[PDB]
Every structure is written in structure tokens, then in C-alpha cells.
């Protein structure tokens, strides 16, 4: 039961900085963006039911 290895993986993981991005809207505007993307935009869906984060 050696405690020598503790935080080894969090220690040896390469440190990648967070990229600077445009701030996201909040409140009613974020909900409006969600509603427009999911119910007003019909182009992406031809009827195959793909997930919003499908990267394949």
C-alpha cells in the first residue's frame, strides 16, 4: 500500500492553456439561441437524428 504515487497522472499531464473565446450569452438570450438552433433550424436534420455533439 505505497502512497508514493499520488497525483502522478495530474502531475505528468501536459498543461494546455484555455483558448480565448467570445463570451457566451446568458439568460433569455441563451435560451433564444438554443430555441433557434434546435427548432428554427431545420437544414441540418434530413431525418437521421444526429446528436448535437456528434464528431463522427
Amino acid at each position: 500500500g505505497s502512497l508514493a504515487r499520488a497525483g502522478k497522472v495530474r502531475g505528468q499531464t501536459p498543461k494546455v492553456a484555455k483558448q480565448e473565446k467570445k463570451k457566451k450569452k446568458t439568460g433569455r438570450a441563451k435560451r433564444r439561441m438554443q430555441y433557434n438552433r434546435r427548432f428554427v433550424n431545420v437544414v441540418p436534420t434530413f431525418g437521421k437524428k444526429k446528436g448535437p455533439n456528434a464528431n463522427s
Partner: peptide
């Protein structure tokens, strides 16, 4: 990636649960 083929192949593997979900998406609004 065929959702039906993925289900028929590796429904019984580590990815069976996620593959089942992808199959249900292809068939109906699951």
C-alpha cells in the same frame, strides 16, 4: 457509421450501452 450495424456487432462490448442509444436515435426519436 451504420447505427444498426454497430448494434449487431458490439452490443455486447464496453460500448453496448452507447451503441444501443445510437441505434434508438436512428430508428425513432429515442
Amino acid at each position: 457509421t451504420d447505427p444498426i450495424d454497430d448494434f449487431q456487432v458490439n452490443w455486447n462490448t464496453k460500448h453496448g450501452s452507447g451503441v444501443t442509444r445510437e441505434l434508438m436515435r436512428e430508428l425513432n426519436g429515442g
